[PDB]
Amino acid sequence: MRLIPLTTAEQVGKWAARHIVNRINAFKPTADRPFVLGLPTGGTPMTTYKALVEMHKAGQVSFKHVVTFNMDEYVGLPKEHPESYYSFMHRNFFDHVDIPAENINLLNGNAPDIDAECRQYEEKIRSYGKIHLFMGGVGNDGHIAFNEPASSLASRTRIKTLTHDTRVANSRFFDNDVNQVPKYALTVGVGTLLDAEEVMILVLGSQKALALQAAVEGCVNHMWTISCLQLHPKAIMVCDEPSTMELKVKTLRYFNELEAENIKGL
Amino acid sequence: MRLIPLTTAEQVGKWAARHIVNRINAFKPTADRPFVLGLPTGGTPMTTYKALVEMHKAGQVSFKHVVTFNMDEYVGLPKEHPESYYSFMHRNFFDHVDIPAENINLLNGNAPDIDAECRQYEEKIRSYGKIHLFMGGVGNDGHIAFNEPASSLASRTRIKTLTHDTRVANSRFFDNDVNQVPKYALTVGVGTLLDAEEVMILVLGSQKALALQAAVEGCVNHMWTISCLQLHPKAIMVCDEPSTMELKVKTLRYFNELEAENIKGL
Amino acid sequence: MRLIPLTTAEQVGKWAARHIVNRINAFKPTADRPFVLGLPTGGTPMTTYKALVEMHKAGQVSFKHVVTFNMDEYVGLPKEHPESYYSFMHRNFFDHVDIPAENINLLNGNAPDIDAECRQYEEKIRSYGKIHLFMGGVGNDGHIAFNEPASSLASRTRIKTLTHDTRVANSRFFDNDVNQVPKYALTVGVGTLLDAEEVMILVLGSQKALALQAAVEGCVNHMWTISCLQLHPKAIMVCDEPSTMELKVKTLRYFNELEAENIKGL
Amino acid sequence: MRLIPLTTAEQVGKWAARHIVNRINAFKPTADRPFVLGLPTGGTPMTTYKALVEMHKAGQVSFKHVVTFNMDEYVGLPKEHPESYYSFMHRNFFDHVDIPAENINLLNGNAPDIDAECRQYEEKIRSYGKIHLFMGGVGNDGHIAFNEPASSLASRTRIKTLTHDTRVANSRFFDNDVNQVPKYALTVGVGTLLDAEEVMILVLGSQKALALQAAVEGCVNHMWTISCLQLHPKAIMVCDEPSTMELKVKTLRYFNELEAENIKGL
Amino acid sequence: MRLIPLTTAEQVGKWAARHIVNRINAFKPTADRPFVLGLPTGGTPMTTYKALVEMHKAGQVSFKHVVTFNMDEYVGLPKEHPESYYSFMHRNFFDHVDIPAENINLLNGNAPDIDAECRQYEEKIRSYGKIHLFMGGVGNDGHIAFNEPASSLASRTRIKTLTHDTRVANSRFFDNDVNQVPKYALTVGVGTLLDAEEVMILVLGSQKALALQAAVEGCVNHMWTISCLQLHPKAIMVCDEPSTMELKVKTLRYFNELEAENIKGL
Amino acid sequence: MRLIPLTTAEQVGKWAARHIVNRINAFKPTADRPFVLGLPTGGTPMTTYKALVEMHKAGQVSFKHVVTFNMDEYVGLPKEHPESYYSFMHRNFFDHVDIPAENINLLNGNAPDIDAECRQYEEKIRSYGKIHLFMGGVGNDGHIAFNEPASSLASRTRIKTLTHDTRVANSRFFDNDVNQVPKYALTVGVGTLLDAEEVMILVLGSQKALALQAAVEGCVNHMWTISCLQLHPKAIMVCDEPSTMELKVKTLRYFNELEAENIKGL
């Protein structure tokens, strides 16, 4: 597992975006062999999207043969609502890069047969073979996407009933109105994430410090889902300074020395 | 992993038996595609067998195309001894349901070539492909079947030398005579159990409280074998009230809310 | 996992060497079906090599159809330097047994294309299929070979920059001159080791006591790489008395009783 | 140490108020031998004051010969500001009972010589001899009054610079304006509290659950000041249901059985 | 704190008895300056009493000016019942040594005013000044005498309601009849014990292993009362081999080396 | 407890020396009311002595009415040996300041009656009343002076048999000859240290990191003697950067903010 200890969110997004760019450029994707990218939404990846767009505009990367899969979507919310994850993803990324519509995959929160929607999503991933790089964030309690603590590490794409803490912490978008916040969401599973070739988790804010600690220094346990990334063949935590509060000083010093050459320029 | 927090043993058996019934009825087994059920013996599954029998008699389930594999058997004990696991299983379950003899698999504790017996058992499981649901209990120290603490998670069906604590705690059946209790037993391995599609562990009694804690809140470690079910794709702990003594109040409250809809009726 | 608690290094080497011999003799290797043995260097396996040689000379084992893979080699050191791992392995083992040159595999620390060298090594292992028994030691911090703490459990053969603690602790061979000690080494990966059928770790000295504890009593975590052997299908720790300092008395007593029959004669 | 596990805040205040009443009535205070009561402010003791007033009005207790000492006061806030602790204490308690002004002791946050004020307060306590019962609450991080984590257990009455978390969590009274909230406060010390004959801590809300756990099940350590009450000769924790979230089920069950006879009626 | 690691109960009693003898002989007690000895009952001190008697008979010690205080007594049991603690103490010790009746102090479980009895006992100890050496055992959960877990460290002599586990584990004397076992007992308090000049705890049996661990390696906490002996000026644990099961090997090795000179002869 | 987190040893000595100076100047010592200072030897306080001397020479402090007590001395070493603690203390401090011989107290390692020497030392401290400030260091295992782990917190001045690790780590002064290093030493006790009014521990080097952690973040336990300073009324840890390796980042950040105003200038 790699830990990239940075100072600010802007540095974290530049690092993550540069990592994505370097994986895409080394892979050399084509129409028949696309690079498959898993993506999250929310405030945490914002500086990464901003930096990815920048690099695209600077001519350093093309998304023409990049296929994407998003982690989740609200159930029963119209796709064109500005707070849908569809809307977030276009406004913050797809509106500014050269990816074709047929390459973009998002869960249909309005599908008539929800279990069918979830089944097809998993099938579509398998039609390409695998996600090469899945970027995500982590909950304060170590959970992933809308999966709950003690989720099966093999769980799959499925509908979830959001937690009060989550409606609550999202009611702001439903202009600060915790009654309109959709009750349910579609989310990829933990197994869906773990099947990716590489997993890169963005960790921002002292509210994630216990999760960072559970991921990096704690032992493997299903109650802190993020800890099971220790068993993943290729996992990376990219973090800012406030998120490191619960780590030991020597842990932070170890990774700061091991990755020093890699965190220049960004 | 699911935790089903119930109050009494009778509720635990009804829940477990209803789960088994629902898996069988959704699977729709046939002569050429049987439902494969792994089973334990002892006091812990008694209320489950009693409830399964009841449901069978009420016409809610048929075992005509259900194939079963038991976890273990005493070595050198005549099969018709009333304390053999063969005898337990017929008296508490098979005597009352419609399963055919050819569908019942039990280890032959009287086989002339013990290693061969153990090899054939594993081969028979593989001939059907997989166990769809393996029901078991857990030792006070978290062990499974007759496997010992720090058993390999890939261990397989094999002969074991029973522990004093086990002969001791079983001498009662050998009418309370710890000298007749067979010295050895045949048992499936931890790998045998983990290869099942779903694992459901019955947890009864405050003597199992540390094991329950190690399974649900502790981290993964081979000394408490039950903790490695955290890594299993589909594991369920079904427990009574006294078994919950070592859990945190919030852990019990979390699962009691998450599974509330599912523990009605039983 | 097995723990073989012995008293002295000489007993540990006899036990390990007898284990190796028994695996080879039960396997019955041939020209077209060799026994594949993974091997380490350093002070820790010395009494094992001495005992293996002895058994060979006593006519108890032949290495004619044994293929070996060593864990590592210094980069840029001439192979005939007496402190190369090539030189160690010939002087302590291959010079005294009947293994053919074509059966010996060592990393070429002088290869012109290092990444290519590392790729070919993994390919050669796969050409035979698998390592049947990989013998190794463990770092004071639980690491394996030249892999670092928090290495991926799927990492593979690759070049590493040695740690000061390692150059320091090896400068003695570069006649106690920490300036000549090569800066880099080639090492198999953790995945390389875990892919072996059986892993046997030699544990000598109270400086390994925390690692032994993390391997046997602690939980699974990537910071102590050796702890992930708890998840390996067939792992054995062979240890001397001073290495047991951080274990609980009952843990040492448990394994001392479970393996009693097996540690006679040696 | 006693733990009184109750369900609601109203029950906690009735229990605490009944305890206070029973200590006062058994002591039989007089003009020359007053009962000395230490008191806190804030939302936590509100139901206790409400119940104390009730009991007073029902003729069950008199405060005529009760002397009180409050834990703290804001520095530079006019005493008649409605949010001063003076104002809180009169409005919620002294306005409704028969205690004489000369018996009421509060820190003068407007004293010209602050260190002198703090010295005199300690001297006044010692002039009576000792506090017989000190009632308080506990911070989310286990701290007491305005003392900080890792305060000396012998610290004494003194001025403190409030924490952002505290100004923040109190800005609501300074009509939700975190700029007017006084920067400093006077507070009794941890030694001041520990010198009382009996200490009764009110614990309300799941935000206090980690503190409750540190007080009752954790070990003694100065970072969670409340844990050092384990060393106090006569300490009582009175808590509501949500505060018990981090305790083990058996801990809550133990105290619920030990104190059962004592939590009836309230 | 000293830990005296011995092998058998007989060695523990000889060591403890020799310690007692050496304290008495160095103190040189007289009519007006007696040696004050606190004593327990039960199976744990039996080999100590047997060895003390032996030493007395060998002329190595006199109890003529030794005053004793016992830890506890059953309430409502006639003193001459053979299972009273009075009866135990005479039959196992006082019947065989030269101590005068006026020097023997035992709680009167038949006193008409129980609280008065308990008050007088504490007063009698204080009339002599202090207990020079208090010998005791420890409960499986670390408790002392009949004090419960989380007892105040300043608690005093008082009546207690016995626990089921205790009636249960003592019903054997009430010829194995858990209905006659007195419901209540008088016991010295934890403060009573801690006020002694030196405290020597006898630890026998693997059932005490967790308590031994909490006393010696764990941190100070009131839930394991025995752990607070770490704060006592002069505490000694005398233990047999099975009691050491939960200690680390290096802990046992440390004390075995530090006390080596002192455990010869016994 | 205060933690003063500094970067280098030179800053630690300046801080400590300034603290000492400020305590002395605020106390205003006289012939009949001296300031009593407890002192250690070794490499750890060297920069403090150097800075104290400097301040003395700058006219900021006088030792005319300062009385000192040193922690320890070698047994049987001639006082004028350059490696005696007498010799260390004169060469590094007393040779450069204005303290009178009658004010200097050091243990006489050559006393004819060792127990008498140790008794008189304690008596001399009590003749002045108390040590106002005791400065010391801490062992890698948290021990104090020559006291061992699990020493009584009330232990007193006494002779000790040095540990191999200590002779070993000091043989360098006995020009790197571990055979001349005295076998025994006189040392103040833990009680002697804890009786001081204020205790200031100098913590230098990553080898002290576990001890620092046990002092500041761990719980109270006698195996890490330094942890019991959490119970001391007025304790200060002054540390350099490498010593902070085992602390959590937030712990170091907390104290760095709380003491910021106090670590300027030095």
mmCIF file of C-alpha atoms in Angstrom, chain C:
data_model
loop_
_atom_site.group_PDB
_atom_site.id
_atom_site.type_symbol
_atom_site.label_atom_id
_atom_site.label_comp_id
_atom_site.label_asym_id
_atom_site.label_seq_id
_atom_site.Cartn_x
_atom_site.Cartn_y
_atom_site.Cartn_z
ATOM 1 C CA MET C 1 -0.078 -22.215 10.896
ATOM 2 C CA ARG C 2 2.394 -24.352 12.822
ATOM 3 C CA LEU C 3 4.806 -23.029 15.435
ATOM 4 C CA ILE C 4 7.752 -25.324 16.209
ATOM 5 C CA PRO C 5 9.181 -24.073 19.514
ATOM 6 C CA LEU C 6 12.747 -25.247 19.912
ATOM 7 C CA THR C 7 15.598 -24.238 22.192
ATOM 8 C CA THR C 8 18.714 -23.589 20.089
ATOM 9 C CA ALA C 9 19.597 -22.543 16.560
ATOM 10 C CA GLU C 10 21.164 -25.958 15.996
ATOM 11 C CA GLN C 11 17.877 -27.623 16.805
ATOM 12 C CA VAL C 12 16.035 -25.189 14.547
ATOM 13 C CA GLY C 13 18.312 -26.011 11.601
ATOM 14 C CA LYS C 14 17.967 -29.753 12.197
ATOM 15 C CA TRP C 15 14.192 -29.506 12.303
ATOM 16 C CA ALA C 16 13.974 -27.349 9.203
ATOM 17 C CA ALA C 17 16.446 -29.500 7.310
ATOM 18 C CA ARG C 18 14.553 -32.670 8.300
ATOM 19 C CA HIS C 19 11.290 -31.014 7.125
ATOM 20 C CA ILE C 20 12.853 -30.155 3.761
ATOM 21 C CA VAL C 21 14.200 -33.698 3.407
ATOM 22 C CA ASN C 22 10.847 -35.235 4.241
ATOM 23 C CA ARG C 23 9.029 -33.021 1.742
ATOM 24 C CA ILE C 24 11.526 -33.912 -0.948
ATOM 25 C CA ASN C 25 11.465 -37.634 -0.219
ATOM 26 C CA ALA C 26 7.665 -37.800 -0.118
ATOM 27 C CA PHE C 27 7.372 -35.863 -3.382
ATOM 28 C CA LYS C 28 9.765 -38.166 -5.237
ATOM 29 C CA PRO C 29 11.146 -35.624 -7.715
ATOM 30 C CA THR C 30 12.243 -36.484 -11.241
ATOM 31 C CA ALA C 31 13.912 -34.792 -14.214
ATOM 32 C CA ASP C 32 10.482 -33.834 -15.543
ATOM 33 C CA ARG C 33 8.889 -33.200 -12.143
ATOM 34 C CA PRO C 34 11.420 -31.477 -9.920
ATOM 35 C CA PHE C 35 10.891 -30.390 -6.304
ATOM 36 C CA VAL C 36 11.105 -26.596 -6.272
ATOM 37 C CA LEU C 37 12.770 -25.081 -3.199
ATOM 38 C CA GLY C 38 12.940 -21.362 -2.351
ATOM 39 C CA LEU C 39 15.937 -20.342 -0.235
ATOM 40 C CA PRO C 40 17.338 -17.448 1.803
ATOM 41 C CA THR C 41 20.816 -16.317 2.825
ATOM 42 C CA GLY C 42 22.334 -14.744 5.949
ATOM 43 C CA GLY C 43 23.178 -15.993 9.426
ATOM 44 C CA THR C 44 19.660 -17.279 10.138
ATOM 45 C CA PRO C 45 19.594 -20.320 7.813
ATOM 46 C CA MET C 46 23.254 -21.341 8.533
ATOM 47 C CA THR C 47 22.484 -24.236 10.881
ATOM 48 C CA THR C 48 19.806 -25.442 8.438
ATOM 49 C CA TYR C 49 22.283 -25.650 5.500
ATOM 50 C CA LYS C 50 24.818 -27.339 7.766
ATOM 51 C CA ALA C 51 22.204 -29.953 8.715
ATOM 52 C CA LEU C 52 20.933 -30.359 5.152
ATOM 53 C CA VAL C 53 24.482 -31.037 3.985
ATOM 54 C CA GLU C 54 24.901 -33.589 6.751
ATOM 55 C CA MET C 55 21.760 -35.462 5.788
ATOM 56 C CA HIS C 56 22.863 -35.452 2.158
ATOM 57 C CA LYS C 57 26.199 -36.888 3.107
ATOM 58 C CA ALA C 58 24.470 -39.513 5.236
ATOM 59 C CA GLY C 59 22.641 -40.566 2.097
ATOM 60 C CA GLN C 60 19.208 -39.399 3.290
ATOM 61 C CA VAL C 61 18.482 -36.979 0.468
ATOM 62 C CA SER C 62 19.501 -36.139 -3.067
ATOM 63 C CA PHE C 63 19.237 -32.735 -4.751
ATOM 64 C CA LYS C 64 19.660 -34.136 -8.297
ATOM 65 C CA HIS C 65 16.077 -33.220 -9.186
ATOM 66 C CA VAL C 66 15.648 -30.285 -6.815
ATOM 67 C CA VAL C 67 15.308 -26.843 -8.393
ATOM 68 C CA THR C 68 16.043 -23.805 -6.251
ATOM 69 C CA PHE C 69 15.166 -20.095 -6.301
ATOM 70 C CA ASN C 70 16.950 -17.662 -3.973
ATOM 71 C CA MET C 71 15.151 -14.650 -2.463
ATOM 72 C CA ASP C 72 17.644 -11.952 -3.375
ATOM 73 C CA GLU C 73 21.020 -10.627 -4.591
ATOM 74 C CA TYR C 74 23.048 -7.427 -4.377
ATOM 75 C CA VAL C 75 22.970 -5.127 -7.369
ATOM 76 C CA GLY C 76 26.333 -4.255 -9.018
ATOM 77 C CA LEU C 77 28.404 -6.598 -6.875
ATOM 78 C CA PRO C 78 30.506 -9.060 -8.934
ATOM 79 C CA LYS C 79 29.018 -12.572 -8.531
ATOM 80 C CA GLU C 80 32.398 -13.974 -7.455
ATOM 81 C CA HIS C 81 32.695 -11.422 -4.645
ATOM 82 C CA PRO C 82 32.717 -13.655 -1.545
ATOM 83 C CA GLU C 83 29.836 -11.657 0.009
ATOM 84 C CA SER C 84 27.490 -11.964 -2.973
ATOM 85 C CA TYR C 85 24.502 -14.171 -2.253
ATOM 86 C CA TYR C 86 25.672 -16.413 -5.112
ATOM 87 C CA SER C 87 28.898 -16.887 -3.147
ATOM 88 C CA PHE C 88 27.152 -17.453 0.167
ATOM 89 C CA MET C 89 24.872 -20.126 -1.379
ATOM 90 C CA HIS C 90 27.661 -22.098 -3.060
ATOM 91 C CA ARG C 91 30.011 -21.955 -0.060
ATOM 92 C CA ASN C 92 27.322 -22.952 2.484
ATOM 93 C CA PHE C 93 25.270 -25.409 0.439
ATOM 94 C CA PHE C 94 25.645 -25.998 -3.284
ATOM 95 C CA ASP C 95 29.403 -26.786 -3.008
ATOM 96 C CA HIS C 96 28.478 -29.780 -0.831
ATOM 97 C CA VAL C 97 25.457 -31.356 -2.508
ATOM 98 C CA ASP C 98 24.554 -32.995 -5.819
ATOM 99 C CA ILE C 99 22.460 -30.265 -7.401
ATOM 100 C CA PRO C 100 23.109 -29.444 -11.060
ATOM 101 C CA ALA C 101 23.903 -25.884 -12.167
ATOM 102 C CA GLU C 102 20.907 -25.800 -14.443
ATOM 103 C CA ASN C 103 18.674 -26.355 -11.401
ATOM 104 C CA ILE C 104 20.002 -23.305 -9.464
ATOM 105 C CA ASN C 105 18.304 -19.967 -9.863
ATOM 106 C CA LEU C 106 19.693 -16.764 -8.427
ATOM 107 C CA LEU C 107 18.905 -13.152 -9.372
ATOM 108 C CA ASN C 108 21.531 -11.571 -11.638
ATOM 109 C CA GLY C 109 22.489 -8.406 -9.765
ATOM 110 C CA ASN C 110 24.686 -7.501 -12.710
ATOM 111 C CA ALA C 111 21.985 -7.790 -15.383
ATOM 112 C CA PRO C 112 22.065 -4.905 -17.855
ATOM 113 C CA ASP C 113 18.262 -4.554 -17.873
ATOM 114 C CA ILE C 114 17.193 -4.856 -14.229
ATOM 115 C CA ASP C 115 13.438 -4.808 -14.780
ATOM 116 C CA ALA C 116 13.887 -7.491 -17.406
ATOM 117 C CA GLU C 117 15.935 -9.655 -15.024
ATOM 118 C CA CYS C 118 13.165 -9.385 -12.425
ATOM 119 C CA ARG C 119 10.467 -10.253 -14.971
ATOM 120 C CA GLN C 120 12.364 -13.323 -16.184
ATOM 121 C CA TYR C 121 12.846 -14.633 -12.656
ATOM 122 C CA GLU C 122 9.073 -14.626 -12.080
ATOM 123 C CA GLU C 123 8.623 -16.170 -15.475
ATOM 124 C CA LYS C 124 11.089 -18.939 -14.677
ATOM 125 C CA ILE C 125 9.212 -19.812 -11.462
ATOM 126 C CA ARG C 126 5.967 -19.987 -13.419
ATOM 127 C CA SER C 127 7.675 -22.152 -16.051
ATOM 128 C CA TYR C 128 7.983 -24.871 -13.406
ATOM 129 C CA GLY C 129 4.565 -24.079 -12.000
ATOM 130 C CA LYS C 130 5.141 -23.343 -8.343
ATOM 131 C CA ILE C 131 7.585 -23.304 -5.480
ATOM 132 C CA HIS C 132 6.720 -26.304 -3.279
ATOM 133 C CA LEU C 133 8.523 -25.020 -0.198
ATOM 134 C CA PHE C 134 9.860 -21.513 0.370
ATOM 135 C CA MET C 135 12.208 -21.178 3.359
ATOM 136 C CA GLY C 136 12.965 -17.665 4.636
ATOM 137 C CA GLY C 137 13.732 -15.519 7.675
ATOM 138 C CA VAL C 138 11.991 -12.388 8.982
ATOM 139 C CA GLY C 139 13.128 -8.834 9.675
ATOM 140 C CA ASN C 140 12.966 -7.320 13.164
ATOM 141 C CA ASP C 141 10.019 -5.282 11.918
ATOM 142 C CA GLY C 142 8.289 -8.343 10.415
ATOM 143 C CA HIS C 143 9.323 -7.638 6.787
ATOM 144 C CA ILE C 144 10.280 -10.321 4.273
ATOM 145 C CA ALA C 145 13.409 -10.437 2.114
ATOM 146 C CA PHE C 146 14.052 -6.861 0.983
ATOM 147 C CA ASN C 147 10.372 -5.990 0.877
ATOM 148 C CA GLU C 148 9.458 -3.064 3.099
ATOM 149 C CA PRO C 149 6.796 -2.784 5.765
ATOM 150 C CA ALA C 150 3.376 -2.069 4.144
ATOM 151 C CA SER C 151 4.525 -3.805 0.985
ATOM 152 C CA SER C 152 1.663 -5.077 -1.177
ATOM 153 C CA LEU C 153 0.935 -8.738 -0.403
ATOM 154 C CA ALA C 154 0.947 -9.199 -4.163
ATOM 155 C CA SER C 155 4.277 -7.462 -4.777
ATOM 156 C CA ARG C 156 6.714 -9.177 -7.194
ATOM 157 C CA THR C 157 10.463 -9.552 -7.856
ATOM 158 C CA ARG C 158 12.018 -6.101 -8.148
ATOM 159 C CA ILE C 159 14.910 -3.794 -7.324
ATOM 160 C CA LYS C 160 15.033 -2.132 -3.906
ATOM 161 C CA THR C 161 17.070 0.622 -2.268
ATOM 162 C CA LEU C 162 18.487 -0.914 0.898
ATOM 163 C CA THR C 163 17.682 0.667 4.284
ATOM 164 C CA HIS C 164 20.421 2.280 6.415
ATOM 165 C CA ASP C 165 19.613 -0.262 9.109
ATOM 166 C CA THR C 166 20.296 -2.922 6.504
ATOM 167 C CA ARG C 167 23.490 -1.486 5.044
ATOM 168 C CA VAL C 168 24.544 -0.792 8.588
ATOM 169 C CA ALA C 169 23.755 -4.328 9.736
ATOM 170 C CA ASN C 170 25.591 -5.722 6.701
ATOM 171 C CA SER C 171 28.596 -3.361 6.462
ATOM 172 C CA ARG C 172 30.479 -6.014 8.522
ATOM 173 C CA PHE C 173 30.640 -8.264 5.537
ATOM 174 C CA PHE C 174 31.796 -5.325 3.443
ATOM 175 C CA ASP C 175 34.571 -5.659 5.898
ATOM 176 C CA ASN C 176 32.727 -3.609 8.460
ATOM 177 C CA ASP C 177 32.691 -0.725 6.001
ATOM 178 C CA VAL C 178 29.290 0.926 5.488
ATOM 179 C CA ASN C 179 30.234 2.684 2.218
ATOM 180 C CA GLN C 180 30.905 -0.325 0.017
ATOM 181 C CA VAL C 181 27.720 -2.196 0.934
ATOM 182 C CA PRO C 182 25.828 -2.119 -2.404
ATOM 183 C CA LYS C 183 23.112 0.520 -2.468
ATOM 184 C CA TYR C 184 20.540 -1.685 -4.131
ATOM 185 C CA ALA C 185 19.355 -5.275 -4.225
ATOM 186 C CA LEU C 186 17.085 -7.506 -6.259
ATOM 187 C CA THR C 187 14.449 -9.296 -4.150
ATOM 188 C CA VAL C 188 11.499 -11.585 -4.677
ATOM 189 C CA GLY C 189 8.180 -10.020 -3.777
ATOM 190 C CA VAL C 190 5.718 -10.836 -1.021
ATOM 191 C CA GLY C 191 3.359 -12.285 -3.656
ATOM 192 C CA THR C 192 6.254 -14.381 -4.926
ATOM 193 C CA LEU C 193 6.651 -15.844 -1.450
ATOM 194 C CA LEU C 194 2.932 -16.270 -0.809
ATOM 195 C CA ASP C 195 2.469 -18.151 -4.060
ATOM 196 C CA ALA C 196 4.599 -20.995 -2.654
ATOM 197 C CA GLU C 197 2.747 -24.156 -1.606
ATOM 198 C CA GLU C 198 4.336 -24.082 1.862
ATOM 199 C CA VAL C 199 6.272 -21.310 3.623
ATOM 200 C CA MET C 200 8.716 -22.090 6.435
ATOM 201 C CA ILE C 201 10.166 -19.136 8.349
ATOM 202 C CA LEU C 202 13.226 -19.525 10.538
ATOM 203 C CA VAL C 203 13.049 -17.336 13.627
ATOM 204 C CA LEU C 204 16.243 -16.905 15.713
ATOM 205 C CA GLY C 205 17.161 -14.417 18.435
ATOM 206 C CA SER C 206 15.320 -12.172 20.845
ATOM 207 C CA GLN C 207 15.571 -9.409 18.245
ATOM 208 C CA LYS C 208 12.841 -11.325 16.312
ATOM 209 C CA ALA C 209 10.532 -11.663 19.288
ATOM 210 C CA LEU C 210 8.165 -8.845 18.305
ATOM 211 C CA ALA C 211 7.983 -10.220 14.795
ATOM 212 C CA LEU C 212 7.200 -13.719 16.138
ATOM 213 C CA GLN C 213 4.472 -12.245 18.264
ATOM 214 C CA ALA C 214 3.021 -10.347 15.314
ATOM 215 C CA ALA C 215 3.111 -13.536 13.214
ATOM 216 C CA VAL C 216 1.513 -15.857 15.771
ATOM 217 C CA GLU C 217 -0.639 -13.884 18.247
ATOM 218 C CA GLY C 218 -1.245 -10.562 16.551
ATOM 219 C CA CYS C 219 -3.870 -9.750 13.972
ATOM 220 C CA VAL C 220 -3.416 -9.534 10.213
ATOM 221 C CA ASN C 221 -1.920 -6.233 9.134
ATOM 222 C CA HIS C 222 0.318 -5.105 6.294
ATOM 223 C CA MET C 223 2.713 -3.168 8.520
ATOM 224 C CA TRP C 224 4.028 -6.494 9.920
ATOM 225 C CA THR C 225 4.227 -8.432 6.636
ATOM 226 C CA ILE C 226 4.875 -11.718 8.448
ATOM 227 C CA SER C 227 1.392 -11.480 10.017
ATOM 228 C CA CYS C 228 -0.175 -12.079 6.629
ATOM 229 C CA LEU C 229 1.189 -15.660 6.724
ATOM 230 C CA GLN C 230 -1.834 -16.334 8.936
ATOM 231 C CA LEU C 231 -3.795 -16.269 5.690
ATOM 232 C CA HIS C 232 -1.425 -18.623 3.909
ATOM 233 C CA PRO C 233 -2.683 -22.182 3.365
ATOM 234 C CA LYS C 234 0.477 -23.816 4.787
ATOM 235 C CA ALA C 235 2.845 -21.792 6.958
ATOM 236 C CA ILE C 236 5.338 -22.895 9.584
ATOM 237 C CA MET C 237 7.366 -20.851 12.060
ATOM 238 C CA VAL C 238 10.443 -22.627 13.435
ATOM 239 C CA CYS C 239 11.906 -20.800 16.367
ATOM 240 C CA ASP C 240 14.497 -20.821 19.107
ATOM 241 C CA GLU C 241 13.988 -19.982 22.780
ATOM 242 C CA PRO C 242 15.123 -16.318 22.870
ATOM 243 C CA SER C 243 12.758 -15.498 19.984
ATOM 244 C CA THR C 244 9.744 -16.419 22.142
ATOM 245 C CA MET C 245 10.136 -13.489 24.623
ATOM 246 C CA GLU C 246 7.047 -11.526 23.527
ATOM 247 C CA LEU C 247 4.651 -14.499 23.353
ATOM 248 C CA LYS C 248 2.248 -15.314 26.164
ATOM 249 C CA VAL C 249 3.286 -18.285 28.299
ATOM 250 C CA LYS C 250 0.083 -20.104 27.350
ATOM 251 C CA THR C 251 0.754 -19.623 23.646
ATOM 252 C CA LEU C 252 4.192 -21.191 23.944
ATOM 253 C CA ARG C 253 2.729 -23.993 26.120
ATOM 254 C CA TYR C 254 -0.043 -24.678 23.562
ATOM 255 C CA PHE C 255 2.332 -25.155 20.652
ATOM 256 C CA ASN C 256 4.838 -27.023 22.805
ATOM 257 C CA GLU C 257 2.121 -29.564 23.553
ATOM 258 C CA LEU C 258 0.625 -29.708 20.059
ATOM 259 C CA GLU C 259 3.986 -30.353 18.371
ATOM 260 C CA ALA C 260 5.663 -32.422 21.062
ATOM 261 C CA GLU C 261 5.732 -35.652 19.071
ATOM 262 C CA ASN C 262 7.211 -33.786 16.156
ATOM 263 C CA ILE C 263 10.190 -32.210 17.820
ATOM 264 C CA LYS C 264 11.924 -35.371 18.926
ATOM 265 C CA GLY C 265 15.103 -36.513 17.197
ATOM 266 C CA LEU C 266 15.040 -33.403 15.032
#
